[PDB]
């Protein structure tokens, strides 16, 4: 079967706090930058 | 013969913001008189009041476009 | 004008469905199919909660029309009480398995 | 024109807009006591410590704010619809001004008389002059009379833009294929200014209006010089 | 044609831990990898096709 | 084990997850779209130098939070959450469709994401209004792939739409009458309501800008017989039903916010708030033409439409004055949930009151396409979707992870953002009084202040955010985990414990009828 | 061990090959617009397929073969398909919307009439009557071939189906052919506009509809249905009727009133 | 609510971490790009 | 309305069966008769290029881009006329 409780009904892996918090910075990271280098793409195309 | 014209007058046909038909309408009686007596052999003039009301409502773009198709034979409306 | 060559239900049903419909010929409800009537609730008649385990989830519409239900674990054992109306219910566990 | 930290509504042009601003006023009064009454309320409710968690019933007291909040509607709506019908009701213009929108200018149409019509554009902040304000002063404004009743004609030969001048209470959409009447009237001389309301491009924040407001004679000797 | 629905009962009732889409057998399983080999190469490709329509291409 | 569970689930809990997940991340996008809007107006002047970059930003910011972050984390998040364990039901009624209206979100975002990165993005706005949106004035693939992106978003929420109304429906107890469901499941079944019948009519509308741009139809462009008022007609005819999608979840989670801080075992006037909620469905189909009084209509139309508007005041104000009346004699625990509860209350009510005062056709005449309109939404989105989103997550987060937050970061976190948001948007009222047009980039000279004022408070919510992060992070990095929740006699939902077990109710409860 | 009567699902990958095949068929679209290429849209459209079969097979499976369909799971299916059917109501509803605004107020472009200045309609007498005499036919049929099922008849319901499908085939080649003959195209403006995009929806429709009942067609000769249970039977008799009311609306609307 | 004392408590320093690596994760990129705007423009 | 027929006792099978052949398969027989009657082609009309007609704002993403999807020669002229 799968793993219940805390920590483990979850995608990603919270073992670790420091793996878990270069997750979460990679991941709402990746989210507010895409927007200004959507801009800085457009900016660049002309 | 009101003449003494300052600007096409409310119509009750049209009353309300969207004014297309009025403009458009006064195009039509317009070449339509003006088909009648440039046959039948009388004067445009009669055919004065459409012209005015026309000339004050349409887009010159419009009368431009309308005119053009005219004479090319694509007129869509009924003259 | 007519014939056959068409299953019935009771040829052809297999699994559950086939289980809820034997448990209802015989009118029983072992798939939660039926609201259960309550009793008076009283010490002496006591709302009679099946249950497969040794806890189940009661809610208590107290009072008929009530849009809250009260909702409360029943354990195995000593008749337990809806803590809004005090009616009082008894699980009788086990069973499945048939 | 608006002016720096401005609060409120430009000052009424005409008394149409003059209508608006007292609307506004009670629409706001209304808005600021409900609000407020909203505010008021939420904090008595949240600042005793005593209690009462047991089921309260709730038949009465529904009467009470339906009824009352229905009422504040209506003392809402009734001036709201005699401004509406008031707006719309017959003025007979002494006057027919046709403006088409475009990316990104606006073009002028006096077709009553002579066959009077140019664009106008946005001066160029580079180009302003001494006291010009930017992105409002355009090279040919708008002249029209003073003190009567113009028609104000409204399209577009590209994409949708709307022509709004908010001194006066104007917005009307500009749409290709489609002529929309409005009715124009400044009590007062001067120059009023708008912008275009309706998102049409790159330029969209670039295309202003401004209406040039001076007496019968001057307007008359304008057109002509402008044939 | 004879009524072989109690044979397929059988086979997808046949208490063996497969999922119901895998549970017809060998094919099931072929079927599902041409899916999804379908779906993740035609995916990768889509994100190909955004890449080169990102930058201009007289 | 890892894509049987993420990538194949047909679990509800799970699914729920996946849900906040993508609303978060679209949350950041979100936010990151709309501080390039504001740094673009914070000083006068052009800073992208570019009106068709910043018309593209404006565009995007609108469909990332209404798509992607709101709509997915309320009905898809809280939704597939709280409404299979308040009914006492094992799953949603199609467990497996549930999970493709999941995976069609990413899908649909890479399309948008796309759209942005070819040509020169849409610089449409999100109502997407021809002919600007039109194969002329936006040549090229851009605008087909925000048409293909809503397609996808579209087909996502009528699907849940028909789960969440077969789930309601269908999976209650035998004995649990719609009249004993709780105020969030109603909030769901009505909000699918209105998804059902709406989103069907944009899709239409959307097609045919399709086929305008790529199939040589003229249902929009007058050469041919067309007219663009036709599809401002069918996408508000979506439009208002949509921003009333976008509130009645949260009138759900507010509903049961106030209801539980107040120590209560139930909230003021059920059946009056069903009512409300009713009511505000059925008249939010029948008021979509306060979007159009200045295409040019007729005056009759424009005082139905006027009047029409103004009704949705009153069940509005029923659920407000119903919700003050929770509050009455409560045993007030100022938790987290509640402050963000009470938040909503007031910032709600503002933005609902401004609302009255654009629903009066003549008014809307000088406030139409201007910063008040601007002003007046995000008193209800940025308030009013999201206080009711932040209120309910930290009220759930502990349900959800079986961890607790520190309450004090999340009461710091309240404030930051209150402070925020107040400041980027009340003095946009002013901006738009004093006649601001809206989607431009820049602006004459005396709309300063108030541009400045509202993009330094862009930056105070910007910190909020990032607060937030590092709070959910604290969360899972300390591992708190939760013993005892107060109230489970009226909050079904936490009965099972935290987090509940992958498989809940398999046993269903038991109601007699009597 | 469940005591509910509901439906727990194996885990399915066909939920993401669906959305998979979305973004590859709306990509392909958008390829094939602008880049002139349809690879995207070939590869998005054949998973698409292969998504539906194996998807629909699973619910084949699940039910006639595993017996996971109580009559609650039933119901549920039930209230689903209604609500599906709703949603494409409003669909259509749409494009009776473009319609009505377009034929009742026709501007100047058109000659300020309908039918528009040059624009040749067909007679609603010819082919568009013989259209309407062949749904409301296989309206007929289908409502047999349902009575036939719950009364144990194999032959005459597998008859009635034959004969709905026959229809539904014949309404297809028939539209197919006045689509070749129209002396008017989708580009003559918004009647073509609203014309060939109207009753082109409704054609996928008959031919969807018309997929599901010959899917019925071979479950039942496979004898999957008993006279007692067979939604997927009843579901497609349900699109059935949806499809064919489309139609007398479209008849009444376009062929007839908009001539 | 109630619950047990974390199982890995996150000390002051620790948080300042979090909070400080996390309001990078937002800003370091989003700066870098606005810092060069100017260098986009011209080109 | 009852139409017109009568029936109604108990609904059968034979009853649907009666009506797919009694009524609804005559209306078809009668509906391709009065079709394959006033079907063989019609006068073509006169070309004029209606600018409200023959629509191009981008080439169809087939052949030329100037042929629409179900092109006739015979009854469909591009926007410069009929075809040879
Ligand atoms: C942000 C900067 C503020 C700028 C103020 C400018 C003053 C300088 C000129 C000093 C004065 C110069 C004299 C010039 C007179 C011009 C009159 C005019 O043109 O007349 C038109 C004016 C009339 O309006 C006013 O009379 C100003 C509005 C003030 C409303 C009360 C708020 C007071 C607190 C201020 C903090 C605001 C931020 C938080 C507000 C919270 C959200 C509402 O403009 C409006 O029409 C504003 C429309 C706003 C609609 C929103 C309705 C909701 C109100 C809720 C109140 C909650 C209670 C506070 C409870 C507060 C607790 C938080
Ligand atoms: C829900 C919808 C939503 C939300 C949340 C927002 C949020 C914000 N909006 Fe939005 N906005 C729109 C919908 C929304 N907006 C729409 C529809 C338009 C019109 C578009 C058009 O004209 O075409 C618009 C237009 C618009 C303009 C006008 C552009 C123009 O006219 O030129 C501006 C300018 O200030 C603006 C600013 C902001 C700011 C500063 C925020 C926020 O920064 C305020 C602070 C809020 C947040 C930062 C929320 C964060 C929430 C999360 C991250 C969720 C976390 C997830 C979990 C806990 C699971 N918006
Ligand atoms: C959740 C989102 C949401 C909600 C709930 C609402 C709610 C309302 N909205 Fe708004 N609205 C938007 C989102 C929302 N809106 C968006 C996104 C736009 C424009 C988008 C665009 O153009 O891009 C918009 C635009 C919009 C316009 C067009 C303005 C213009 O473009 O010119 C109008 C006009 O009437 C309007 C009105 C209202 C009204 C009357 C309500 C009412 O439902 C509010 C009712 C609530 C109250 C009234 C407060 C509570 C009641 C009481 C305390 C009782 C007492 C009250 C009285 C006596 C009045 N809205
Ligand atoms: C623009 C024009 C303007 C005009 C103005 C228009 C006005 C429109 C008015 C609409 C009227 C609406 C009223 C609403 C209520 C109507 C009646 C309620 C029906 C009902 O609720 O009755 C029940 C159901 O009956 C049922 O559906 C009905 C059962 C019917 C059976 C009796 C019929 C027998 C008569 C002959 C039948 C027709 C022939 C059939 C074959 C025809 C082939 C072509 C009770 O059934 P029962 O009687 O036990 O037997 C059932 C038969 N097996
Ligand atoms: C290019 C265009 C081509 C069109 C293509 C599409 C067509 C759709 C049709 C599909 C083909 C299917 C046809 C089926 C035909 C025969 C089935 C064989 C069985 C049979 O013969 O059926 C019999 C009756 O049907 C019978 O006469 C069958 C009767 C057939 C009816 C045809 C109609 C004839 C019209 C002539 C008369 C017109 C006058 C009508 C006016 C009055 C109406 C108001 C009864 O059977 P049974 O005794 O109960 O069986 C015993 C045990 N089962
Ligand atoms: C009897 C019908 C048989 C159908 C099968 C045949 C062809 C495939 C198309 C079917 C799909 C149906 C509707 C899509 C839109 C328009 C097509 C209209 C129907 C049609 O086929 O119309 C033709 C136009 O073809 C054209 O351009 C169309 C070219 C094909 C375009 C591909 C579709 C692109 C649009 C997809 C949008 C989908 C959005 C759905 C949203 C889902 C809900 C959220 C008419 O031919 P013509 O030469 O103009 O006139 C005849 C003159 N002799
Ligand atoms: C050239 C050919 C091109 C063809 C490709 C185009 C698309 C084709 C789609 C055709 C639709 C096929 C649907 C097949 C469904 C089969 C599964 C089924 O029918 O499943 C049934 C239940 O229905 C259920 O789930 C309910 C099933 C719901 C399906 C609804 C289908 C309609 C919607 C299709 C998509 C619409 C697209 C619209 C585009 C704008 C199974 O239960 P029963 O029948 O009671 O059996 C059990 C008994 O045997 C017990 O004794
Ligand atoms: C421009 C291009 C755009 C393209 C977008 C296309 C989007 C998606 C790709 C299509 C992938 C579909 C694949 C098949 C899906 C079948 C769904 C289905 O059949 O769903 C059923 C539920 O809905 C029911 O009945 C009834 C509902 C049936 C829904 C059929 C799905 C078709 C989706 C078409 C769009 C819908 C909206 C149309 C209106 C505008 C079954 O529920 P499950 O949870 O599976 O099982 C539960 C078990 O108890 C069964 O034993
Ligand atoms: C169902 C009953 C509800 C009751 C409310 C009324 C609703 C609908 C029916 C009304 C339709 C006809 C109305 C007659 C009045 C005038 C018609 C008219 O002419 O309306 C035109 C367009 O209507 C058009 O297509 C309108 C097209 C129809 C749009 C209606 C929108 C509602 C659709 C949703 C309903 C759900 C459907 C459920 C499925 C059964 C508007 O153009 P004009 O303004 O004339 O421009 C000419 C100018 O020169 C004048 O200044
Ligand atoms: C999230 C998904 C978003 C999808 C975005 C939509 C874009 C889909 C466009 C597909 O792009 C294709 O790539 C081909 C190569 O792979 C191109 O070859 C073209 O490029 C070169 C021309 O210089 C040469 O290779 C060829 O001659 C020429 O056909 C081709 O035109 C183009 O259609
Ligand atoms: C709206 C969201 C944005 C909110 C504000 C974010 C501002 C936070 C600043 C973080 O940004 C850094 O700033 C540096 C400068 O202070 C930049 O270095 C730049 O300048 C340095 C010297 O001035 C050089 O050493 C570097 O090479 C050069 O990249 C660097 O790239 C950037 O990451
Ligand atoms: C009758 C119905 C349900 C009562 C019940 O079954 O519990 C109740 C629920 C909400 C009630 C309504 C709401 O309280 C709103 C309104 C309040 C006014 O006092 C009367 C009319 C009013 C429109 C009410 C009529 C009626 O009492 C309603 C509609
Ligand atoms: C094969 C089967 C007889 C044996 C059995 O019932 O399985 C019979 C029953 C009904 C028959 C079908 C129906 O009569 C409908 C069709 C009639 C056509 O004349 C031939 C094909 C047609 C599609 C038939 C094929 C086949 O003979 C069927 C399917
Ligand atoms: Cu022109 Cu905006
Ligand atoms: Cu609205
Ligand atoms: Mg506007
Ligand atoms: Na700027
Ligand atoms: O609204
Ligand atoms: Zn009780």
Redesign the interface.
Known sequence: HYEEGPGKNIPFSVENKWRLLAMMTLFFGSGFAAPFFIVRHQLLKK | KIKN??????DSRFP?????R??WQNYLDFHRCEKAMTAKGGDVSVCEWYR?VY???????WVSTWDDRRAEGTFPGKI | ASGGGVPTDEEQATGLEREVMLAARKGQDPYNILAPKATSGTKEDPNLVPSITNKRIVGCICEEDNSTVIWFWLHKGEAQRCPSCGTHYKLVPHQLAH | ??????????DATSPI?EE?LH??DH??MI?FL??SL??Y??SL??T?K????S??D?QE??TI??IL??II?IL??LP??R???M??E?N?????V?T?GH?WYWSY?Y??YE?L?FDSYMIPTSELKPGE????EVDNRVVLPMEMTI?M???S????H?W?V?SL?????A????????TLMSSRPGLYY?????????????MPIVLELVPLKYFEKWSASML | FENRVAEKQKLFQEDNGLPVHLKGGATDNILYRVTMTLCLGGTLYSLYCLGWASFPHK | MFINRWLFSTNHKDIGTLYLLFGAWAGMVGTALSLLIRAELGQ?GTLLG???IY?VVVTAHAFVMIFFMVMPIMIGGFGNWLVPLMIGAPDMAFPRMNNMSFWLLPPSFLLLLASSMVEAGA???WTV????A?N??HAGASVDLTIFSLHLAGVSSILGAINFITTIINMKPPAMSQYQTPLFVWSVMITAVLLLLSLPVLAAGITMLLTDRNLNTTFFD?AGG????LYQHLFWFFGHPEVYILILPGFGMISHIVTYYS????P??Y??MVWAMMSIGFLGFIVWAHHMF???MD?DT??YF??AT??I??PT??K??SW??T??????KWSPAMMWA?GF??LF??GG??G??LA????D??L???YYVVAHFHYVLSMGAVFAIMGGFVHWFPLFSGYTLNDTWAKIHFAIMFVGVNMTFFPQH?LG?????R????????????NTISSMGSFISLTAVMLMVFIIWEAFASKREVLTVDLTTTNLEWLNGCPPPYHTFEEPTYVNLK | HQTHAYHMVNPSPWPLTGALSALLMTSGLTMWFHFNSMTLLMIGLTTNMLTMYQWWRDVIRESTFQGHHTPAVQKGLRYGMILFIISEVLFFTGFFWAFYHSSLAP???LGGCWPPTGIHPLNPLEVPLLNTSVLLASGVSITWAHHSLMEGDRKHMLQALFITITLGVYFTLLQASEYYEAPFTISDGVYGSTFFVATGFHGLHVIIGSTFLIVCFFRQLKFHFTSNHHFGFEAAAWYWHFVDVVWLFLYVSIYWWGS | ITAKPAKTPTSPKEQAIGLSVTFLSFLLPAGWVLYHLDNYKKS | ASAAKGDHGGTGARTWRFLTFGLALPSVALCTLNSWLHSGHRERPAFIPYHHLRIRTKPFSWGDGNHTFFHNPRVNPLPTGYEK
């Open positions: 014209y300052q600007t096409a007058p409310f309300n913001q969207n004014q297309t009025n403009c005015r000339k004050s409502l349409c887009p010159i773009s | 024109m608006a002016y720096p930290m401005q609060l409120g509504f430009q807009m608006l609307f506004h629409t706001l808005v409900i609000s909203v505010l309320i939420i409710m949240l005793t005593l209690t009462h968690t089921t309260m709730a007291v529904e704010w339906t909040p229905a509607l809402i709506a709201s619809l401004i509406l019908y707006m719309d017959i007979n213009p002494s006057l027919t046709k088409m990316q149409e077709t009553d066959d019509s304000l930017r992105l409002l028609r004609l409204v399209s030969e590209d994409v949708l709307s709004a908010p209470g104007l917005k009307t959409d749409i290709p294929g489609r002529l929309n009447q409005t708008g912008q275009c309301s309706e998102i049409c491009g790159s330029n969209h924040s670039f | 006068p570019d009106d068709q018309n610089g449409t706005g209004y021809p002919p600007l039109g002329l004035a007058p067309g007219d663009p008022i120590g209560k075992k139930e003021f006037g059946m009056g200045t295409v040019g005056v424009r005082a006027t009047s103004m009704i005041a009153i104000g029923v407000v004055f003050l009346a509050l009455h004699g409560g045993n007030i009470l209350i007031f009510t503002v009151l401004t009255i005062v009066n056709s003549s008014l005449i000088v139409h396409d201007t002013f009084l004093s006649g601001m047009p989607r431009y980039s820049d602006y004459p000279d005396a709309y300063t202040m108030w | 501007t100047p472009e």
